[PDB]
Symmetry: C2
Subunit: 151 residues, 2 copies
């Protein structure tokens, strides 16, 4: 059981690579093979709706907005760590992008399973993720730069 997800830059509309999802004894592993991203730590989460289309919010366009909020089947309404149960189950460890703009560092999500991810969108944000709604909500990820639908 292994799946590959195509990731696309929402700003340019061009592909940036793929992410392989595999199931193992300790949870779901996300193995990235991305490029053309800004160096640093990027917010990385699974979102509710399976779509990367835009959305409208008070007159302004929201790239990746159709993806909705963070996957939260427990209805926790809080953003947190990948190893805490009182927050979005869609909260994954932050995504690392090297100096050359490449991301190849695999991350583990202990609270997730492969079967429940189908039909959900994988998001990559511009900012990082301190896994808290403070000082900024949703860990401070801000804008959504890359997105892909898990099918």
């Amino acid at each position: 059981q292994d799946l590959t997800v195509k990731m696309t830059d929402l700003q340019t509309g061009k592909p940036v690579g793929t992410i392989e999802l595999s199931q193992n004894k300790y949870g779901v592993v996300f193995i990235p093979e991305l490029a053309d991203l800004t160096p640093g730590m990027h917010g990385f989460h699974i979102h509710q709706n399976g779509s990367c289309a835009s959305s409208e919010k008070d007159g302004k366009v929201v790239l990746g907005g159709a993806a909705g909020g963070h996957y939260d089947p427990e209805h926790t309404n809080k953003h947190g760590f990948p190893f805490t149960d009182d927050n979005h189950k869609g909260d994954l460890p932050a995504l690392f992008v090297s100096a050359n703009g490449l991301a190849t560092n695999p991350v583990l999500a202990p609270r997730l399973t492969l079967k429940e991810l189908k039909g959900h969108a994988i998001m990559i944000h511009a900012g990082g993720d301190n896994h808290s709604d403070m000082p900024k909500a949703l860990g401070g990820g801000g804008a959504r730069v890359a997105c892909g639908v898990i099918q």
Copy 2:
């Protein structure tokens, strides 16, 4: 059950911060609060001996050498991922250092427990960690830059 470990730069001999270890349902969490480190991804592992003293290797001095190799109670003799069982149980996820030389991104080790860590050394390497003995052994961490004994 929470422990704090003092980390010291092996080259300068000066402290660089602390790392808090806590036990949770999914494993051991390492919460770093370090500074004065080089930006980028650093190899991060638990070593066999509880010491950060130097060692001698074919006439050359080895900073942090007294720490021995990677914690490997299973005697796997292989270096790998934190979520694979056929490799050093001391293999942790790589440590991220921001542009300002600070490391505050918590990491999870699903295969570890707090009680077995006492008496072991926590190591931070100069290079990164691709979690494989190829192309470079021990994931390519190279020299040991920071070390601390878990007591």
